[PDB]
Write an enzyme that holds these catalytic residues in place. Structure first.
Site, PDB file in Angstrom:
ATOM      1  N   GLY A  17     -11.140  47.448  64.232  1.00 21.40           N
ATOM      2  CA  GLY A  17     -11.797  47.179  62.952  1.00 21.40           C
ATOM      3  C   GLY A  17     -12.593  48.379  62.442  1.00 21.40           C
ATOM      4  O   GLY A  17     -12.940  49.291  63.207  1.00 21.40           O
ATOM      5  N   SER A  18     -12.880  48.356  61.139  1.00 21.44           N
ATOM      6  CA  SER A  18     -13.506  49.476  60.414  1.00 21.44           C
ATOM      7  C   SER A  18     -14.476  48.962  59.344  1.00 21.44           C
ATOM      8  O   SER A  18     -14.102  48.839  58.171  1.00 21.44           O
ATOM      9  CB  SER A  18     -12.429  50.347  59.751  1.00 21.44           C
ATOM     10  N   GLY A  21     -20.037  51.785  60.777  1.00 20.43           N
ATOM     11  CA  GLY A  21     -19.369  50.807  61.625  1.00 20.43           C
ATOM     12  C   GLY A  21     -17.900  51.098  61.929  1.00 20.43           C
ATOM     13  O   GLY A  21     -17.133  51.452  61.041  1.00 20.43           O
ATOM     14  N   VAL A  23     -14.969  49.509  65.260  1.00 22.37           N
ATOM     15  CA  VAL A  23     -14.771  48.863  66.560  1.00 22.37           C
ATOM     16  C   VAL A  23     -13.496  49.382  67.213  1.00 22.37           C
ATOM     17  O   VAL A  23     -12.450  49.378  66.572  1.00 22.37           O
ATOM     18  CB  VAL A  23     -14.667  47.333  66.436  1.00 22.37           C
ATOM     19  N   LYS A  38     -18.260  48.809  69.882  1.00 20.45           N
ATOM     20  CA  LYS A  38     -18.746  48.892  68.523  1.00 20.45           C
ATOM     21  C   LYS A  38     -19.477  50.201  68.413  1.00 20.45           C
ATOM     22  O   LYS A  38     -20.401  50.450  69.179  1.00 20.45           O
ATOM     23  CB  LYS A  38     -19.703  47.727  68.241  1.00 20.45           C
ATOM     24  N   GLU A  76     -17.333  42.118  75.277  1.00 20.12           N
ATOM     25  CA  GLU A  76     -16.107  41.400  75.592  1.00 20.12           C
ATOM     26  C   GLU A  76     -15.151  41.470  74.406  1.00 20.12           C
ATOM     27  O   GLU A  76     -15.569  41.459  73.244  1.00 20.12           O
ATOM     28  CB  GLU A  76     -16.387  39.934  76.033  1.00 20.12           C
ATOM     29  N   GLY A  80      -8.775  37.496  68.851  1.00 24.98           N
ATOM     30  CA  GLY A  80      -8.523  36.791  67.615  1.00 24.98           C
ATOM     31  C   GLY A  80      -9.041  37.459  66.359  1.00 24.98           C
ATOM     32  O   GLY A  80      -8.656  37.090  65.263  1.00 24.98           O
ATOM     33  N   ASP A 121     -27.724  37.165  58.702  1.00 26.55           N
ATOM     34  CA  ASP A 121     -26.511  37.780  58.152  1.00 26.55           C
ATOM     35  C   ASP A 121     -25.274  36.999  58.587  1.00 26.55           C
ATOM     36  O   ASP A 121     -24.246  37.579  58.886  1.00 26.55           O
ATOM     37  CB  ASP A 121     -26.437  39.246  58.620  1.00 26.55           C
ATOM     38  N   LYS A 123     -21.976  35.375  58.174  1.00 25.46           N
ATOM     39  CA  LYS A 123     -20.863  35.402  57.237  1.00 25.46           C
ATOM     40  C   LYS A 123     -19.541  35.502  58.038  1.00 25.46           C
ATOM     41  O   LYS A 123     -19.582  35.772  59.238  1.00 25.46           O
ATOM     42  CB  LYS A 123     -21.023  36.532  56.205  1.00 25.46           C
ATOM     43  N   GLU A 125     -17.288  37.635  58.367  1.00 26.33           N
ATOM     44  CA  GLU A 125     -17.135  38.929  59.051  1.00 26.33           C
ATOM     45  C   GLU A 125     -17.840  38.971  60.426  1.00 26.33           C
ATOM     46  O   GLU A 125     -17.417  39.753  61.305  1.00 26.33           O
ATOM     47  CB  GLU A 125     -17.655  40.094  58.188  1.00 26.33           C
ATOM     48  N   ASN A 126     -18.880  38.136  60.606  1.00 28.26           N
ATOM     49  CA  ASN A 126     -19.712  38.151  61.808  1.00 28.26           C
ATOM     50  C   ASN A 126     -19.424  37.014  62.776  1.00 28.26           C
ATOM     51  O   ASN A 126     -20.203  36.736  63.712  1.00 28.26           O
ATOM     52  CB  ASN A 126     -21.186  38.171  61.395  1.00 28.26           C
ATOM     53  N   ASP A 142     -23.341  40.588  65.523  1.00 28.35           N
ATOM     54  CA  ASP A 142     -24.105  41.418  64.543  1.00 28.35           C
ATOM     55  C   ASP A 142     -25.523  40.936  64.260  1.00 28.35           C
ATOM     56  O   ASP A 142     -25.784  40.256  63.267  1.00 28.35           O
ATOM     57  CB  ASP A 142     -23.384  41.586  63.198  1.00 28.35           C
ATOM     58  N   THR A 161     -62.983  31.409  58.105  1.00 29.52           N
ATOM     59  CA  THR A 161     -63.304  30.774  56.831  1.00 29.52           C
ATOM     60  C   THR A 161     -62.649  31.609  55.731  1.00 29.52           C
ATOM     61  O   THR A 161     -62.720  32.834  55.752  1.00 29.52           O
ATOM     62  CB  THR A 161     -64.823  30.693  56.608  1.00 29.52           C
TER      63      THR A 161
END
Ligand SMILES: C/C(=N\NC(=N)NO)c1ccc(NC(=O)c2cc3cccc([N+](=O)[O-])c3[nH]2)cc1
Ligand SMILES: C/C(=N\NC(=N)NO)c1ccc(NC(=O)c2cc3cccc([N+](=O)[O-])c3[nH]2)cc1
Lengths: 284, 284
Positions: A17-18, A21, A23, A38, A76, A80, A121, A123, A125-126, A142, A161
């Site tokens: 992945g890209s 960032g 991976v 990562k 790990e 998928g 965050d 979503k 993507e995460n 993330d 007070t």
């Protein structure tokens, strides 16, 4: 080049992945097993600290960390890929698959909130998938925007007070301690997208600004896409997309909703946990 | 006992104050000069860092710091004591003395706000007097609740598309970046007490709760105490005790108010600065 300490323990391979960032696939020399690495261009050490403390099957674990050059986080492998890819281009999951995935995201987020962590965050993507099969374990990843709850500056202020205390601090008392509810709103949006194949708030074919759609809570309902989705699923979505954070469903209340009282799904989850687990002999 | 490193440079003497905290008289061995030593029972290192960076005549300077045992902070002696003692028991300052003191607090707080610092605990206990004379320099102290402004989590969130962003985060955009206004509210309360000898919000002889007095902005006005106080002074007080933080006077606007356009007072301040300053020859 890669840092010497990393190259010492791992052999680097292709890109998986890209982000924004990167991976990469790697092999751990000692075991010859696949890991994911990562790479983040240079609170990442704080994200590492947070992730070393966490122990839940639906949350990513760190196997190793190197601070070069850049930051490299070993984890790990999740063959998928991202949930994002299963929902992009109006592709949508079967209702039973959403329920399985969503149940896992709730348990993950519940565990975060019990341990004083807000993700901030969530979503597609995460969210990562353990295998290429539809019925699988997912893990949340993330933690770069995450936040540790604790003794607030607000609590320390209210011990004295308020002779000298400004009105806006006293008014903020009514709504403090609900920061975690932003994670429940995000889950609601993710669920919506999963069940329907499209996002609830969007600039596609509207004149209402994105901001105005979100603050009014008026999500884009298209009756003919939802026709094939149960009422229970839609009802949960509606209790998560509530604009008042105090009235919004928490992870607890979402786990007790009729849509997640599905014993087939829970068994399918328990059995996936056993498949993953390979460890030591027990007494007895 | 006192720590060895402290005893090495200073000889300890009598108590000057007893907070909640203790302040002692000491002599610096090298120079035989009086200093004050604040002892705090064990972000104090962060308070030290903040106070090492600051350079304004109306803000306390740190001469030294030791971390035992307890924390010991060495500073310049302020023989006049706390402003609190000049205003307790309905004692009140002459209007000209308030203007002198208040002008200094504004400049101090202005300088803090220009440098990204919010004090958050301004009160008469935290204002110190340089001498026992009414016309003197004051210095603000006690940065234990202070806060460094910077790139917020809010700003980072608003760079992406808010597809997944909760409504309360978008609504908070309207009022963010006004945290500093709590210092201006505190100044307003301090000014009130100085001009009048009594606090604006209090449980003395009322049934309105303290909280309700503050959030409505309905300060206790007693016409016969204020009779001898100018209108201009009262008008400034009213622009600082405004409940909406966005409409409240900033330090800048308070420095431009008719009450502080008093050239006698400013000259009296400039001359006090020269009295304090004893340093090197200049070209020419
Ligand atoms: C901890 C973290 N990011 N932290 C952060 N601060 N980012 O800015 C983090 C973010 C993303 C990932 N992603 C993966 O592990 C990951 C992405 C991906 C895509 C296709 C295929 C695989 N795969 O393992 O088969 C993938 N793994 C792993 C960790
Ligand atoms: C930095 C600080 N506190 N920080 C903190 N975190 N407190 O909790 C701090 C607080 C208070 C003071 N006070 C004084 O220096 C101080 C108090 C006082 C009373 C009578 C007389 C004198 N005097 O120097 O003559 C006094 N000096 C000095 C420093």
């Amino acid at each position: 080049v890669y840092p010497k300490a990393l190259r010492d323990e791992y052999i680097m391979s292709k890109t998986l992945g890209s982000g924004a960032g990167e991976v990469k696939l790697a092999f751990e020399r000692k075991t010859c097993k696949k890991v994911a690495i990562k790479i983040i261009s240079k609170n990442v050490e704080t994200e590492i600290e947070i992730l070393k403390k966490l122990n839940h099957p639906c949350i990513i674990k760190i196997k190793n960390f190197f601070d070069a050059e850049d930051y490299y986080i070993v984890l790990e492998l999740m063959e998928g890929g991202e949930l994002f890819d299963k929902v992009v281009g109006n592709k949508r999951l079967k209702e039973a698959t959403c329920k399985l995935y969503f149940y896992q995201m709730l348990l993950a987020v519940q565990y975060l909130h019990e341990n004083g962590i807000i993700h901030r965050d969530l979503k597609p993507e995460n969210v990562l998938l353990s295998s290429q099969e539809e019925d699988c374990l997912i893990k949340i990843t993330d933690f770069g925007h995450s936040k540790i709850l604790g003794e607030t500056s607000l609590m320390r202020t209210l011990c004295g007070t308020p002779t000298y205390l400004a009105p806006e601090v006293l008014v903020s008392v009514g709504t403090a301690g609900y920061n975690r509810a932003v994670d429940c709103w995000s889950l609601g949006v993710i669920l919506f997208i999963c069940l329907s194949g499209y996002p609830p708030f969007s600039e596609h074919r509207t004149q209402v600004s994105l901001k105005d759609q979100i603050t009014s809570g008026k999500y884009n309902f298209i009756p003919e896409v939802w026709a094939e989705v149960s009422e229970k699923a839609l009802d949960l979505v509606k209790k998560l997309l509530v604009v008042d954070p105090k009235a919004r469903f928490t992870t607890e209340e979402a786990l007790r909703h009729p849509w997640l009282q599905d014993e087939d799904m829970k068994r399918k989850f328990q059995d996936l946990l056993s498949e993953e687990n390979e460890s030591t002999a027990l007494p007895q």
